[PDB]
């Protein structure tokens, strides 16, 4: 089957010389192409995209003076050795110095007072307390008494954060941010600090958007926050570094975009401790006693959130995108074929054109549909075609007769490409077995009148022995047969001559049923000496 | 070429009125559509997805009492100022106090004893030691001697972590987790704490799955771990916050899912220090000497792993997905066309239907294949068609003759749409040049018998001068020619009349080869007065 | 419309028995299939990919001796309790001990000297200073005077980092890295340490590439850096853990790849403080005074960057990819159809084949194009076809005549499938209204000569009453009509007989325009007794 495989199958097409459909087809082609090109370029769908790998190094600069005598805060005093994605700047603080692990009364709170030891419970762990009770109601001061606890003593008082913030001059502090980013898939590395950047720059949204030295108060202004107010209880501020990087040589750009967003929830419910603070202890020994200064530090935690993508041209990405948009170029074909199949219907003239006469020249689709689509029937064993000489159409009786004569069984109308049922006076009763008799109980005409076998052309197109012999010799020029063999060939050829004449197409002539008058006239002209006639047999 | 471009080409189609193929085609259309719709909706393939940008703020609450007198541990004692993605809770500890940078003997280990200075090596750095040897085997105690080292003295003893853990009451500690998440591409921000959440809630997998206050022991229970056992040597616990967020207005939901997973490897080999611990020093001065208390802290490091995606409807994402699934609607066409092309073969009746008679009504595909596919031959210069009057088929001799007469060169069988090689007694030797003689050495019949030129229709269809003149005038109604011009046109028309009659289609009649008898009978009826006959020439 | 929906439409195709096109079609099919398969397998486009969730635990090991007497540095002295994605190793340091919050002169800098109090400014905050000026120029030493500041005193001197680094023996330190990774979507967890790994291993790029114990100097060597030189001022070193993980059972592999990259910028401008350092303070009390030792620590920050993807087979991913590459199998059809449509043009023989005769056997595409494409015209109301008996082509006059006789209005040439304008002497003036007269002002021939109505076949094909009656009876075998009805049917049938004869196809015969001579000869043979002749009317 080497020749069976080496074959090419091409579609048969009808090329229409129509300027309307040629223009519509090309207009739809540009619309699809314009959107496909726009989607590819705007979304960089030809690029293989990769998340960024970031490293952040921060350096805070600034000195603070706190009036309380005067204490100095440099970077070692309000910051911590961490210089990565997060750094903390202390803006407020409460101190409780000289704490010793011993027994002491609780600080008087909203419910920390007691009047008897029955109120205190030994081993109890008050969620708002920093010690474990011993069940003793010792005196805190002269006025009131509080339950004794095991804790660092004296316990930290429920003192609010100072207002204004002790280190609110941190607004004028600056942080330098060094961001190293990398794309391991594309093997590309860059940093946020350009060689042109000087140390005297400060970030501005419009004047210096690439300087990575930020004033803290400027950061808060750009986020819509008030540094002075947030400094009292603290908060979390997000410094977002966005990297939209194009690594293609012809459109190369890998630069950061700086934005600022508060990550603290200012509407935090009071039970969740709004703001940002933590407690840390400075441990020291004094008089052979382990002492501790406890500091509740308020301030801003700055989170450096670095995100972004690096794209570079990928051939496989482009191939996948192009293949995923190739089917959209069939839109013009779908639309115009729908127009052809829809405007070729008979309800167009019946119930559309009289209303709207602007659509009148769309009758050309009836011609287009004729040249495009050919309808065929499934050749089932019960497929029958009936033509009546007194009718302009052809009936298709595709159902089983079930003993009803074919004359009375009406079928679907199809355009042409002595017995009780007889209406011409020439038909004869079927000589088939009684089960199949209803097939041959067909007349040449539906309504009474002249028989078709009495027409001039019936003797010329069907019964002429010379013409049938000429057709037989056209099939086989050197043909010698006996009378019995010749009669059978002439009889079967006369059936086809009637079927072709009255039904036109061989598709319908194959399942055409001869009327009884015509069938028996043919059988009289070319008789069968011995045996009975088979009748119509299913061609498949 | 304005009219050349403004054209529309449509496919020629055969519409089959078959309920089986119409049902199969629609059933396959629903199957493709059902899967395409299901894949799009279940996977949200219409959405542009974005990784989350997360910020975590944690607050641990709890007080611990350690029995050793009694020491108090509050958050400043077992936690560190870090409150981001990681926080540490100390659950056990070993202390070595009053260390001084001086010379001291090594602690007695499995191989730290010595009996001579030759065992010790000056400057040696034992991997299991905390000092550098000086080559001297000083006495540690009365029983044994150990190598002298430069270290903080005395060196920390090889003491195991206490069992049970000193701060195993950390099981009852709680952590509040504040998670701020953001989708910069979609510009959406939310947090894990809803306004409905109260401070008295505790997380439960089924009762309070949205409360972000977690008991540490509950975290360990939900991970399948035992807090009490892990507390002795420490470990790493992962708190996973998963954000499956739909940002479409009609299906909006952005809420976290909490899961817990141990990140420590409990099956760690002993050389890799299983558990979690670190050594830190509390530095202080005493008697003008730089002293240090060294603490080996065991405990749980909690990692807050926040991940997830935020999806919102994207038109370009939907267009790409739809275009990438449009080709699947050709599946019905492919399947039914395969059925038509396969069940139309002759081996169906030969070796399939006798076995299985259920497939018998599939003979309709032979009719479908006839109305769908037309087979044509490549018109190569060696393409020849031969018809023998005593055969029912037509031979295609597509090979070069190479001096073998065309009568004997057998070719592929194709259905019809005096010389030694002669078998009819009427053929004449070719008058062509000897190289091309084998072309015209063809008889009308394969086996001996009557010549086709003696048939009645040969004189009527091929030789009739009146009919050929009528055909010529049909071509050109007003045609005047001399006898030499008329004879040439009549002779060439008689070749085509024979070729059309004996081969049917003009595709095969173009390459049909006339038998010598017919060719010379035609040339006798319409002779060429001067010159020689060209013979058959390749039409392309 | 149950039968209207249950229909199947198949394309009509031409199957070409060509080995060249069959081979080209299959070769292009393998090329598309080979690339589609290669792209799918190399890029794992059948897999659903997921970013990794990582947890890192590090442990640094090593002791350092610093010569300054001799001070010992163990992990508590050069590292910090952080053991996650970042750890710091101190390699150099400058100490300023015994600092007290008081008033002191500034350290003499390049511009810190003063000669009068007018130079100093009270409250000034020098960016290079660690205090706030009080406007007083106190003496620092005997030689020079500096402005008094409020700071920790004495202020840290502008001392360079020691060279060589004090803790450059950190080169021989080792870090053990434990990496737990997870794929929450695929529910897969693994770690970087295999059970086969022993504690005596050290990482080597080729000898032990899976051991996660790294010498720091080896890390710097693998990054192309010098640990000894970087140790003086510090730097940031990236340890990259790449996880290319295949989670399919038949190709399972999830192992890390270790690479090293310096994240510090060695070419940093001096104003941005190149290297890596931070200042931290050791707070202590002495003589009831809050004292502090300030250390400027230089060293290497190591960032553990863990990235990667985990892929597992996804059915929806495969379906989307296959559907997005199905349209590429139409490439063979597009190419071969382009070959057929292009090599069938007449400029091939005119201006291509004489130059290149290798392309000569490509004339078979003219035959292929004939069997594939049928061209039809849009049936517009101004569509006219004209045939002249003295011409070999047929003119298409698709434009409006606008009073110009159809004889003179030339149209496009189309191959056949008494009055002043008359050139045959038999034409008659039109009897139509004057506006439409130009339609019927057409002669049978362009140039003077014999009329076509004087031909023998005109009386046989057009005027023969017997033949027209036979055609009428073929339409309707039992037809009885009056002379007026018979004449109208015979006249209209004779128009079609002329149009079919002279134009061939019914597509062109529908819009064919009869010459005046033929029209009036037909109207003379079959006259209209009463009324006037309608003439040609638009068939649509
Ligand atoms: N289409 C069609 N074919 C028929 C009809 N009647 C008979 N035939 C065909 O005639 C052939 C032989 O039928 P018949 O002459 O009655 O049987 P026979 O005398 O034994 O050969 C069969 O192949 C039938 O297909 C008819 O009404 N319509
Ligand atoms: N198909 C076919 N055509 C033939 C054959 N023999 C001759 N012809 C055609 O007849 C035409 C003229 O051949 P011929 O009459 O022998 O040469 P002429 O007398 O010089 O015109 C050529 O165009 C041939 O294509 C044949 O056997 N088969
Ligand atoms: N194609 C074509 N059809 C024509 C021409 N002239 C007349 N007819 C057709 O002839 C039919 C009747 O025209 P005519 O005999 O002149 O009018 P009538 O005598 O009133 O029936 C119309 O349907 C026309 O389509 C012609 O030149 N070309
Ligand atoms: C009557 O049918 C003749 C009309 C000829 C022009 C038809 C134009 C129809 C409008 C375009 C329809 C296809 C586009 C559909 C949207 C993609
Ligand atoms: C004989 O061929 C007649 C059978 C008519 C119904 C054919 C049904 C075949 C089963 C469906 C085949 C196409 C689906 C293939 C799987 C996608
Ligand atoms: C003349 O046209 C006959 C040539 C027969 C073989 C044609 C081969 C052409 C080369 C292949 C063209 C299609 C591939 C285009 C690149 C994808
Ligand atoms: C910030 O600096 C400016 C100018 O140096 C000063 O006017 C302002 O008071 C400062 N803000 C704070 C909060 O100290
Ligand atoms: C910031 O908040 C403080 C209160 O702490 C207020 O006095 C000040 O006016 C605010 N600044 C602005 C610009 O609103
Ligand atoms: C946790 O608390 C419960 C009730 O307060 C107590 O019974 C239990 O012993 C505690 N667990 C530890 C480890 O302290
Ligand atoms: C947890 O481990 C401890 C050992 O440290 C054991 O005594 C206790 O029974 C364990 N708890 C459970 C629930 O298994
Ligand atoms: C590292 O160790 C080797 C061998 O122990 C030694 O020779 C070398 O001097 C050491 N390097 C440093 C910087 O101490
Ligand atoms: C590393 O740098 C030091 C300078 O600090 C230099 O002495 C040494 O030779 C360098 N090592 C190499 C291998 O270049
Ligand atoms: Na497609
Ligand atoms: Zn009858
Ligand atoms: Zn009848
Ligand atoms: Zn012969
Ligand atoms: Zn012969
Ligand atoms: Zn004329
Ligand atoms: Zn004329």
Tab-separated table of C-alpha atoms in Angstrom, chain B residues 66-389:
chain	number	residue	atom	x	y	z
B	66	UNK	CA	10.637	27.373	85.924
B	67	UNK	CA	11.476	25.255	88.981
B	68	UNK	CA	15.236	25.202	89.575
B	69	UNK	CA	14.590	28.985	93.292
B	70	UNK	CA	11.823	30.021	90.901
B	71	UNK	CA	12.514	32.073	87.770
B	72	UNK	CA	9.858	33.892	85.737
B	73	UNK	CA	9.753	33.844	81.928
B	74	UNK	CA	7.582	36.383	80.137
B	75	UNK	CA	7.659	37.201	76.424
B	76	UNK	CA	10.893	39.166	76.853
B	77	UNK	CA	12.484	36.012	78.320
B	78	UNK	CA	11.512	33.245	75.868
B	79	UNK	CA	10.897	35.259	72.666
B	80	UNK	CA	12.895	37.732	70.568
B	81	UNK	CA	11.932	41.123	69.064
B	82	UNK	CA	11.304	39.416	65.700
B	83	UNK	CA	7.570	39.228	64.938
B	84	UNK	CA	7.539	38.437	61.222
B	85	UNK	CA	7.429	35.138	59.335
B	86	UNK	CA	9.404	33.427	62.121
B	87	UNK	CA	9.234	33.505	65.893
B	88	UNK	CA	11.035	31.373	68.458
B	89	UNK	CA	9.621	30.053	71.744
B	90	UNK	CA	12.222	28.654	74.208
B	91	UNK	CA	10.931	25.399	75.804
B	92	UNK	CA	14.175	24.095	77.424
B	93	UNK	CA	17.644	25.478	78.276
B	94	UNK	CA	21.096	24.757	79.733
B	95	UNK	CA	23.078	27.551	81.395
B	96	UNK	CA	26.810	27.946	82.019
B	97	UNK	CA	27.374	31.149	83.980
B	98	UNK	CA	30.416	33.257	84.782
B	99	UNK	CA	32.582	32.438	81.767
B	100	UNK	CA	35.871	34.318	81.405
B	101	UNK	CA	38.266	34.459	78.449
B	102	UNK	CA	41.245	32.640	79.971
B	103	UNK	CA	43.013	29.271	80.022
B	104	UNK	CA	41.222	26.220	81.401
B	105	UNK	CA	41.214	22.436	81.003
B	106	UNK	CA	38.817	20.888	78.527
B	107	UNK	CA	35.650	19.280	79.801
B	108	UNK	CA	36.087	15.484	80.022
B	109	UNK	CA	34.539	14.030	76.866
B	110	UNK	CA	34.687	10.587	75.260
B	111	UNK	CA	38.204	11.380	74.034
B	112	UNK	CA	39.178	14.612	75.783
B	113	UNK	CA	41.314	12.944	78.463
B	114	UNK	CA	45.102	12.959	78.229
B	115	UNK	CA	48.005	11.278	80.001
B	116	UNK	CA	50.941	13.216	78.482
B	117	UNK	CA	51.578	16.484	76.669
B	118	UNK	CA	52.337	14.438	73.542
B	119	UNK	CA	48.606	13.714	73.220
B	120	UNK	CA	47.687	17.413	73.218
B	121	UNK	CA	48.623	19.501	70.179
B	122	UNK	CA	49.191	23.251	70.399
B	123	UNK	CA	46.844	25.224	68.164
B	124	UNK	CA	44.568	22.243	67.533
B	125	UNK	CA	40.879	22.944	66.932
B	126	UNK	CA	38.767	20.023	68.117
B	127	UNK	CA	35.412	20.024	66.261
B	128	UNK	CA	33.645	19.065	69.510
B	129	UNK	CA	35.510	21.648	71.625
B	130	UNK	CA	34.942	25.357	72.233
B	131	UNK	CA	38.615	26.312	72.536
B	132	UNK	CA	42.016	26.090	70.879
B	133	UNK	CA	44.523	23.780	72.545
B	134	UNK	CA	47.887	24.981	73.849
B	135	UNK	CA	49.540	21.546	73.963
B	136	UNK	CA	49.396	21.258	77.767
B	137	UNK	CA	47.604	18.450	79.625
B	138	UNK	CA	46.480	20.295	82.765
B	139	UNK	CA	44.326	18.556	85.419
B	140	UNK	CA	40.573	19.056	85.185
B	141	UNK	CA	39.723	17.192	88.394
B	142	UNK	CA	41.531	14.732	90.663
B	143	UNK	CA	40.476	11.687	88.631
B	144	UNK	CA	41.437	12.735	85.100
B	145	UNK	CA	43.365	15.329	83.105
B	146	UNK	CA	42.308	17.195	79.963
B	147	UNK	CA	44.148	19.301	77.405
B	148	UNK	CA	44.382	23.002	78.198
B	149	UNK	CA	42.501	25.285	75.807
B	150	UNK	CA	42.026	28.998	75.246
B	151	UNK	CA	38.285	29.551	75.628
B	152	UNK	CA	35.577	31.041	77.781
B	153	UNK	CA	36.133	29.307	81.069
B	154	UNK	CA	34.962	27.016	82.382
B	155	UNK	CA	33.910	25.412	79.097
B	156	UNK	CA	30.293	24.340	78.737
B	157	UNK	CA	29.761	20.777	79.910
B	158	UNK	CA	28.350	18.149	77.549
B	159	UNK	CA	25.028	18.287	79.404
B	160	UNK	CA	21.902	16.902	77.737
B	161	UNK	CA	18.759	18.975	77.471
B	162	UNK	CA	16.651	18.597	80.641
B	163	UNK	CA	13.796	16.099	80.453
B	164	UNK	CA	11.041	17.101	80.972
B	165	UNK	CA	11.488	20.494	79.317
B	166	UNK	CA	11.919	23.392	81.729
B	167	UNK	CA	9.384	25.553	79.853
B	168	UNK	CA	7.005	22.839	78.647
B	169	UNK	CA	4.146	25.032	79.918
B	170	UNK	CA	4.669	26.918	76.643
B	171	UNK	CA	2.138	24.384	75.328
B	172	UNK	CA	-0.533	26.676	76.789
B	173	UNK	CA	0.933	29.822	75.231
B	174	UNK	CA	-1.024	31.466	72.435
B	175	UNK	CA	0.141	33.380	69.372
B	176	UNK	CA	-1.966	35.939	67.534
B	177	UNK	CA	-1.103	36.082	63.831
B	178	UNK	CA	-1.864	39.157	61.724
B	179	UNK	CA	-1.498	38.489	57.997
B	180	UNK	CA	-1.731	41.352	55.507
B	181	UNK	CA	-1.836	40.123	51.914
B	182	UNK	CA	-1.859	42.034	48.650
B	183	UNK	CA	-2.224	41.429	44.916
B	184	UNK	CA	-0.348	44.275	43.185
B	185	UNK	CA	-1.518	43.301	39.701
B	186	UNK	CA	-5.178	43.216	40.727
B	187	UNK	CA	-4.679	46.036	43.281
B	188	UNK	CA	-6.472	44.072	46.003
B	189	UNK	CA	-5.608	44.114	49.711
B	190	UNK	CA	-7.104	42.161	52.599
B	191	UNK	CA	-6.136	40.782	55.999
B	192	UNK	CA	-6.814	37.553	57.861
B	193	UNK	CA	-8.548	39.190	60.853
B	194	UNK	CA	-12.183	40.054	60.194
B	195	UNK	CA	-14.008	42.779	62.151
B	196	UNK	CA	-16.255	40.048	63.590
B	197	UNK	CA	-13.293	38.332	65.268
B	198	UNK	CA	-13.042	38.803	69.033
B	199	UNK	CA	-10.036	38.455	71.301
B	200	UNK	CA	-11.590	35.584	73.255
B	201	UNK	CA	-11.530	33.240	70.256
B	202	UNK	CA	-9.130	30.349	69.814
B	203	UNK	CA	-8.515	28.538	66.549
B	204	UNK	CA	-10.330	25.258	66.000
B	205	UNK	CA	-10.288	23.240	62.793
B	206	UNK	CA	-14.098	22.985	62.742
B	207	UNK	CA	-15.467	25.327	65.427
B	208	UNK	CA	-13.378	28.486	64.818
B	209	UNK	CA	-11.373	27.930	61.612
B	210	UNK	CA	-10.963	31.682	60.987
B	211	UNK	CA	-9.667	32.758	64.406
B	212	UNK	CA	-5.958	33.571	64.128
B	213	UNK	CA	-5.144	32.994	67.810
B	214	UNK	CA	-3.477	29.594	68.153
B	215	UNK	CA	-2.522	27.564	71.190
B	216	UNK	CA	0.954	26.138	70.606
B	217	UNK	CA	-0.040	22.701	71.876
B	218	UNK	CA	-3.078	22.820	69.605
B	219	UNK	CA	-0.762	23.634	66.691
B	220	UNK	CA	1.313	20.569	67.541
B	221	UNK	CA	-1.786	18.380	67.879
B	222	UNK	CA	-3.037	19.495	64.457
B	223	UNK	CA	0.350	18.562	62.964
B	224	UNK	CA	0.347	15.120	64.587
B	225	UNK	CA	3.194	16.014	66.953
B	226	UNK	CA	3.657	15.909	70.722
B	227	UNK	CA	4.585	19.322	72.118
B	228	UNK	CA	5.900	17.829	75.362
B	229	UNK	CA	8.313	15.485	73.575
B	230	UNK	CA	9.457	17.998	70.938
B	231	UNK	CA	10.005	20.620	73.659
B	232	UNK	CA	12.998	18.754	75.124
B	233	UNK	CA	15.303	19.237	72.126
B	234	UNK	CA	13.255	21.699	70.071
B	235	UNK	CA	12.015	21.695	66.525
B	236	UNK	CA	10.659	23.741	63.652
B	237	UNK	CA	6.894	24.017	63.196
B	238	UNK	CA	5.318	25.380	60.025
B	239	UNK	CA	2.150	27.452	60.176
B	240	UNK	CA	0.826	27.530	56.622
B	241	UNK	CA	-1.541	30.304	55.555
B	242	UNK	CA	-3.061	29.439	52.186
B	243	UNK	CA	-4.906	32.129	50.218
B	244	UNK	CA	-7.130	30.764	47.441
B	245	UNK	CA	-8.695	34.076	46.448
B	246	UNK	CA	-11.295	34.756	43.758
B	247	UNK	CA	-11.421	38.476	42.989
B	248	UNK	CA	-14.342	38.341	40.551
B	249	UNK	CA	-17.326	40.347	41.761
B	250	UNK	CA	-19.827	37.536	41.177
B	251	UNK	CA	-17.739	34.874	42.968
B	252	UNK	CA	-15.652	36.946	45.371
B	253	UNK	CA	-13.908	35.169	48.246
B	254	UNK	CA	-10.480	35.930	49.750
B	255	UNK	CA	-10.065	34.062	53.039
B	256	UNK	CA	-7.127	32.109	54.483
B	257	UNK	CA	-6.855	28.389	55.230
B	258	UNK	CA	-4.659	27.378	58.219
B	259	UNK	CA	-2.627	24.170	58.224
B	260	UNK	CA	0.258	22.963	60.366
B	261	UNK	CA	3.291	20.917	59.369
B	262	UNK	CA	6.471	20.022	61.212
B	263	UNK	CA	9.508	21.257	59.284
B	264	UNK	CA	12.065	19.611	61.568
B	265	UNK	CA	13.245	16.125	60.614
B	266	UNK	CA	12.707	13.927	63.667
B	267	UNK	CA	14.724	11.152	61.976
B	268	UNK	CA	17.790	13.401	61.733
B	269	UNK	CA	21.096	11.593	62.121
B	270	UNK	CA	22.851	12.440	65.377
B	271	UNK	CA	25.771	14.206	63.669
B	272	UNK	CA	23.378	16.851	62.299
B	273	UNK	CA	22.097	17.862	65.778
B	274	UNK	CA	18.402	16.874	65.642
B	275	UNK	CA	15.953	19.356	67.112
B	276	UNK	CA	16.356	23.124	67.301
B	277	UNK	CA	18.737	25.008	69.570
B	278	UNK	CA	21.208	27.867	69.610
B	279	UNK	CA	23.788	29.317	71.968
B	280	UNK	CA	23.647	32.962	72.990
B	281	UNK	CA	25.619	34.912	75.568
B	282	UNK	CA	24.653	37.539	78.133
B	283	UNK	CA	27.700	39.792	78.435
B	284	UNK	CA	28.417	41.719	81.624
B	285	UNK	CA	31.331	43.143	83.590
B	286	UNK	CA	32.256	42.012	87.097
B	287	UNK	CA	35.333	43.165	89.040
B	288	UNK	CA	36.613	44.878	85.866
B	289	UNK	CA	36.453	41.524	84.037
B	290	UNK	CA	34.481	40.877	80.846
B	291	UNK	CA	32.205	38.004	81.881
B	292	UNK	CA	29.552	36.045	79.979
B	293	UNK	CA	26.662	33.729	80.784
B	294	UNK	CA	26.241	31.193	77.981
B	295	UNK	CA	22.753	29.773	77.428
B	296	UNK	CA	21.986	26.852	75.128
B	297	UNK	CA	18.337	27.546	74.318
B	298	UNK	CA	16.080	24.768	73.052
B	299	UNK	CA	12.651	25.526	71.686
B	300	UNK	CA	10.270	25.635	68.767
B	301	UNK	CA	10.879	27.916	65.818
B	302	UNK	CA	7.535	28.689	64.185
B	303	UNK	CA	7.677	29.518	60.473
B	304	UNK	CA	4.666	31.374	59.067
B	305	UNK	CA	4.505	30.205	55.448
B	306	UNK	CA	2.000	32.348	53.543
B	307	UNK	CA	1.276	31.334	49.957
B	308	UNK	CA	-1.596	31.463	47.524
B	309	UNK	CA	-2.937	33.032	44.375
B	310	UNK	CA	-5.441	35.709	43.465
B	311	UNK	CA	-7.427	35.282	40.259
B	312	UNK	CA	-9.545	37.799	38.376
B	313	UNK	CA	-11.280	37.474	35.019
B	314	UNK	CA	-9.018	38.294	32.071
B	315	UNK	CA	-10.404	38.665	28.557
B	316	UNK	CA	-7.097	37.750	26.901
B	317	UNK	CA	-6.831	34.647	29.089
B	318	UNK	CA	-10.312	33.566	27.992
B	319	UNK	CA	-9.596	34.267	24.313
B	320	UNK	CA	-6.386	32.221	24.407
B	321	UNK	CA	-8.117	29.297	26.130
B	322	UNK	CA	-11.076	29.310	23.728
B	323	UNK	CA	-8.784	29.451	20.710
B	324	UNK	CA	-6.747	26.578	22.142
B	325	UNK	CA	-9.874	24.392	22.363
B	326	UNK	CA	-11.575	25.294	19.065
B	327	UNK	CA	-9.737	22.568	17.133
B	328	UNK	CA	-11.378	19.930	19.345
B	329	UNK	CA	-14.725	20.583	17.639
B	330	UNK	CA	-13.308	18.907	14.538
B	331	UNK	CA	-13.349	15.604	16.413
B	332	UNK	CA	-16.847	14.733	15.185
B	333	UNK	CA	-15.838	15.468	11.595
B	334	UNK	CA	-12.658	13.400	11.948
B	335	UNK	CA	-14.511	10.440	13.474
B	336	UNK	CA	-17.408	10.374	11.011
B	337	UNK	CA	-15.128	10.914	8.008
B	338	UNK	CA	-12.964	8.039	9.244
B	339	UNK	CA	-16.115	5.918	9.473
B	340	UNK	CA	-17.088	6.876	5.915
B	341	UNK	CA	-13.625	6.234	4.466
B	342	UNK	CA	-13.163	2.953	6.348
B	343	UNK	CA	-16.560	1.258	5.945
B	344	UNK	CA	-16.527	1.975	2.191
B	345	UNK	CA	-13.715	-0.519	1.565
B	346	UNK	CA	-14.263	-3.833	-0.203
B	347	UNK	CA	-12.749	-5.863	2.654
B	348	UNK	CA	-15.833	-4.982	4.659
B	349	UNK	CA	-17.992	-7.348	2.665
B	350	UNK	CA	-15.076	-9.704	2.081
B	351	UNK	CA	-13.893	-10.335	5.626
B	352	UNK	CA	-15.881	-8.328	8.188
B	353	UNK	CA	-19.606	-8.572	7.424
B	354	UNK	CA	-19.782	-12.414	7.164
B	355	UNK	CA	-18.327	-12.580	10.684
B	356	UNK	CA	-20.366	-9.741	12.149
B	357	UNK	CA	-23.754	-9.097	10.586
B	358	UNK	CA	-24.580	-6.300	12.996
B	359	UNK	CA	-22.375	-4.055	10.940
B	360	UNK	CA	-24.220	-4.974	7.766
B	361	UNK	CA	-26.252	-1.754	7.431
B	362	UNK	CA	-22.955	0.130	7.324
B	363	UNK	CA	-22.836	-0.434	3.587
B	364	UNK	CA	-24.316	3.047	3.251
B	365	UNK	CA	-20.752	4.350	3.617
B	366	UNK	CA	-19.930	3.064	0.130
B	367	UNK	CA	-22.614	5.429	-1.158
B	368	UNK	CA	-21.376	8.229	1.118
B	369	UNK	CA	-17.788	7.794	-0.064
B	370	UNK	CA	-18.939	7.987	-3.689
B	371	UNK	CA	-20.632	11.354	-3.114
B	372	UNK	CA	-17.714	12.713	-1.055
B	373	UNK	CA	-14.408	11.720	-2.678
B	374	UNK	CA	-13.302	11.844	-6.314
B	375	UNK	CA	-9.992	10.156	-7.123
B	376	UNK	CA	-7.764	11.587	-9.851
B	377	UNK	CA	-4.417	10.465	-11.249
B	378	UNK	CA	-1.307	12.582	-11.538
B	379	UNK	CA	-1.042	13.348	-15.293
B	380	UNK	CA	2.538	12.249	-15.828
B	381	UNK	CA	4.041	11.897	-19.334
B	382	UNK	CA	4.043	8.082	-19.068
B	383	UNK	CA	0.372	7.863	-18.052
B	384	UNK	CA	-1.521	5.542	-20.401
B	385	UNK	CA	-5.001	4.031	-20.324
B	386	UNK	CA	-5.860	0.827	-22.189
B	387	UNK	CA	-9.322	-0.645	-22.746
B	388	UNK	CA	-9.824	-4.142	-24.157
B	389	UNK	CA	-13.203	-4.870	-25.724
